[PDB]
Design a protein around this ligand. Structure first.
Ligand SMILES: O=P(O)(O)OC[C@H]1O[C@@](CO)(OP(=O)(O)O)[C@@H](O)[C@@H]1O
Ligand SMILES: O=P(O)(O)OC[C@H]1O[C@@](CO)(OP(=O)(O)O)[C@@H](O)[C@@H]1O
Ligand SMILES: O=P(O)(O)OC[C@H]1O[C@@](CO)(OP(=O)(O)O)[C@@H](O)[C@@H]1O
Ligand SMILES: O=P(O)(O)OC[C@H]1O[C@@](CO)(OP(=O)(O)O)[C@@H](O)[C@@H]1O
Ligand SMILES: [Mg+2]
Ligand SMILES: [Mg+2]
Ligand SMILES: [Mg+2]
Ligand SMILES: [Mg+2]
Lengths: 332, 332, 332, 332
């Protein structure tokens, strides 16, 4: 058995050499993960289900856990005295940590991914993206430190709260998965080099929004449903409704997750900086691919803190098929 | 706070008056649920993921947890000295408990529902159906005690192993949900009278098998995707891949679960006695509806222990729509 | 592995044949045990340490946990609808359960034994004594049902909250020990027939009260300290300060627990009905002995609900030595 | 709420300024503490009770947990890549960690204190002492780095596995206590500046070894038993049999722990380096006193790795009384 902490110590060569800082960063993450896990694991008996009475900066009806997760992760990150500030999907502005002007890291987060699944005992998660600041240390970080392109991330990962609670991350040298052991109260390594299998046979998308999908996506969907054993078609459909959850399964069994533009979300629903970039960094480290249907997610220059974007991620051949259909059937 | 055990004591009028027997029956269930929960909650750290090397009587590639769950629930039921025998989706024949010829109850079970989700940290469950034997007490039960129609069940329910572990059941007087509290090691009441909301806006089906669905189901699907605010359309799509899990969400938020006949499963994939009947008894007690697309699931006279059947379950208006389309578009 | 519940089902011949009632009784016990264990296991982080601001009917400064334990066990017993009423070391009068006039059992309890050890993370426990009522069923129990001699107990046992939480009990056919498994949330059998070893080498007493002990006890103490290998002397001294805890160790390794009359407690400190009788029933079922220094604890006719009594319990030869010294050195 | 990790970050001024190193050191400690806690918390259900079949370098019959604890803590310390080597009460020689010649810290430990209490569900503990090496970094530590006087410790503390699991330590700026929360899987601060109360009224000693105690100790004992309200006498007696446990209680309620020379242990039973020094450093930081009956424990120049020593520790006035009686009654 090897804990997450010991693994971080072990892999000194990773993280651009800062072992002690990576430890503090992930220590804050798992602390927050543990705190959140506790409430979720007893959701029905704990008063955490339902709307908090506030509306997201995303223009969404916030749930109580969303806020709880937000505050806990935020306090956990501020207490390690290692981050200068954070950006969160539940916050309107960036949060500058007072007294941390000295810190050289910033963290972008999606505190509780899969809000719709909280009340129904279905998998939810947490997503984090870590960047090295660009502004002068000793000064308060600015949006400039939060609008860097995905290819500049020094770390990214997620926590999935499912039948078991796992923490998955990368620093640019493969994707490592750790499982929380309630018997010990520690995260243990369960898979050091996660990689998408050779071929994927599952597509994850909200087919209820069919009519409003780009014509290329509609065609790809039809493609998935055609019969062709030579290529494992028709594919199996799986859509949990939680990004972290569907991503995790697809990484283990192979598959693709799709969230294109719809009527309600002209530019896709997911957010570039809190959801797309971190998951793209992960998908790529696993030998997969992630694009907005045309260009590489990690190379997109962010325009606004809460910018949204179409997202297609998973096995390379599958994502490549999507890109080809959009190419052959551009939506007029 | 009120535990499952205290609730059973409290609701004396339910279960056709046998409080002490209902307690023993569910005591075996939660014991098995707890044992299974333990392994699943640490799946990655425990050697339980993967094929066991055997093939189901369903002609399926059995997973290790499937067997584990089977043996544990079976031993738990035999140890309460309250059941004469069991039938299981993982067993070829009925299991007659030696020394229990005196018992007057039989239990049909789906030890581990959602086998495909075990290795990917996604929700799985357990389904149980309880019948009062028809054969003379003191004698070994026969298939006759296991082939009774669904309307004869004296109890049914399920265990869902998701972000939290819950036990949901009914004895004919509403559906009660209990959440397991790891802090206490007990199941606590969290919802006494679960009922489907007035309207449902979600459909759960494996759309990858589209081309092979009955034409009426294909039409219903298209219907779900049309735009019509007056009727909350298009609906949201959600398909976890675990029957228990999708059912649970639909019962709480409203929706319909569909598993019609396909090329691989001419008579639907789900099994009448271990999956359809218990979930139909539950759906009905919640004010919902469950049919095979034409007739009431609970009134079907079972022909074989492992008989399969098309299954449409959830909000009544939604299930009624499915039945209407199959009616208007009979598949030639 | 075999749980407490399954063991009770198994040993049908015990408990004067009432399996279903013994199950309900102990089910209430472990529920209360679990609830108490939860707070104690996190005592430092939970606001439960310190005086509650009330004085025991024992004329003692009550601690918060004492009351918590009292209320929880009381509510747990009332909710099983199996007990007509209870008597407790923390209550002035007997508690008659409204609506349970039909119940035929009464329970006497010491909700939290070892009050002085609660704040210092040291072992504490719970003691229960179960009697069959003597008053007409259908009527409210009276003190008469609570003042029966110890030899009339149909059951007795204790819960020890130490490095691990165990439940030890007897119904007149040996002493059975069960350990709580936090991983499963169930009590598992760990020792079916506990018996004192052949010889004991440990004495448990509060030697700080030496000068005020009966002269016979002072002599026994000196005896324990003499050197004599032929008889394993001098003995080892062990006094945890918690009756349940010192008893448990002595039952496993052999030894004697002593609490004679002192200046502050002319008739010993322990209470006959809530502490002495149950532990005496247990000690005897393990092949041990329990007396007030002269006569058999279990045969004493109780005079008052809160009567106190000298208590010497453990290996028979050791208790016999105490009785001999008191005999040879009667305190004038 | 504040975790142990966050507290360490917070108190930068302590530990002679090495926050990142103190974190790694205690991280290894709690990991080991957690691992040990897991087995102990289920001792009866886990095969860990009983002799391992080997004899300590102490000439004692080793128990299975003793060895388990030893190996786990040892592996946990080696995996942090922060310690050059360790000395343990269960090891004959010092353990030099290969590949850690670069580390500048050494740890002396008593992996499992209170071996006699393991099988009887009574409190046990773990003791650690941390020193900064004296030998040239880059070279393998030698006994010289392990035979430094107690006053050179840069850190010390213990883990007590009782009704709850706590971690208590000091780096020279007061004694801090943390409680493990099984609900979260983290150690939380529960008391930042533990101090002995003004006066103590409890003495902890194995009075079974009376006849062989130094005459001064025999007199002190008699003193404790005299009646004198003006000075809270006679004192209460408490002796759990576990050093860590009796120490903890005495620190919270006030008292003294005594283990003088006996027939079997001419130089006391406790070991200077693994038991006396760390507990003396702790007692002193709490405003208490610790001596061998004549001189200050922390100033004694260690002669051998496994040197034993008389130990009197707790409230200053009580320890001072012991020293006075030994002075007035030197044992001829
Ligand atoms: O309800 P739809 O439109 O399918 O959106 C589902 C997607 O939205 C997200 C957004 O984070 O969930 P949610 O809005 O419920 O938080 C993703 O986790 C998920 O993949
Ligand atoms: O893979 P598909 O064909 O969608 O089948 C999913 C359905 O099959 C079942 C059968 O029990 O899961 P599984 O076969 O993986 O055990 C249901 O739980 C689930 O709803
Ligand atoms: O403090 P002293 O007088 O030794 O009393 C200890 C005895 O008293 C009892 C009484 O129950 O503890 P406590 O009063 O602290 O509750 C026994 O558990 C214990 O054996
Ligand atoms: O059995 P006695 O001689 O009282 O020794 C008890 C003392 O010895 C120690 C030594 O560590 O316990 P143990 O030998 O059982 O490990 C101390 O923890 C305890 O205070
Ligand atoms: Mg999200
Ligand atoms: Mg199934
Ligand atoms: Mg008591
Ligand atoms: Mg020790």
């Amino acid at each position: 058995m090897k804990t997450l902490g010991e693994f971080i110590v072990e892999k000194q060569h990773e993280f651009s050499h800062a072992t002690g800082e990576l430890t503090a960063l992930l220590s804050a993450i798992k602390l927050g993960a543990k705190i959140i896990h506790r409430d979720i694991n007893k959701a029905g008996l704990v008063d955490i289900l339902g709307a908090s009475g506030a509306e997201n900066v995303q223009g969404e009806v916030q749930q109580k856990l969303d806020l709880f997760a937000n505050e806990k992760l935020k306090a956990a990150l501020k207490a390690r005295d290692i981050v200068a500030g954070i950006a969160s999907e539940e916050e309107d502005e960036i949060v500058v940590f007072e007294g941390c002007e000295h810190a050289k890291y910033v963290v972008l987060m999606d505190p509780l991914d899969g809000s719709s699944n909280i009340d129904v005992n279905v998998s939810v998660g947490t997503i984090f993206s870590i960047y090295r600041r660009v502004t002068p240390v000793g000064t308060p970080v600015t949006e400039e430190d939060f609008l860097q392109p995905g290819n500049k991330q020094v770390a990214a990962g997620y926590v999935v709260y499912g039948s078991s609670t796992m923490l998955v991350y990368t620093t640019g040298c493969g994707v490592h998965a750790f499982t929380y052991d309630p018997s010990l109260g520690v995260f243990c390594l369960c898979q050091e080099r996660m990689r998408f299998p050779e071929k994927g046979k599952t597509y994850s998308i909200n087919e209820g929004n069919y009519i409003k999908f780009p014509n290329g996506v509609k065609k790809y969907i039809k493609f998935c449903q055609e019969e062709d054993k030579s290529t494992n078609r028709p594919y199996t459909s799986r859509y949990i409704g939680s990004l972290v959850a569907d991503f995790h399964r697809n990484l283990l069994k192979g598959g693709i997750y799709l969230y294109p533009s719809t009527a309600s979300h002209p530019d896709g629903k997911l957010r570039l900086l809190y959801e797309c970039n971190p998951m793209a960094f992960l998908a790529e480290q696993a030998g997969g691919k992630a694009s907005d249907g045309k260009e590489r997610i990690l190379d997109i220059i962010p325009e606004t803190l809460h910018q949204r974007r179409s997202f297609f991620v998973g096995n390379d051949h599958m994502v490549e098929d999507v890109e080809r259909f959009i190419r052959e059937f551009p939506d007029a």
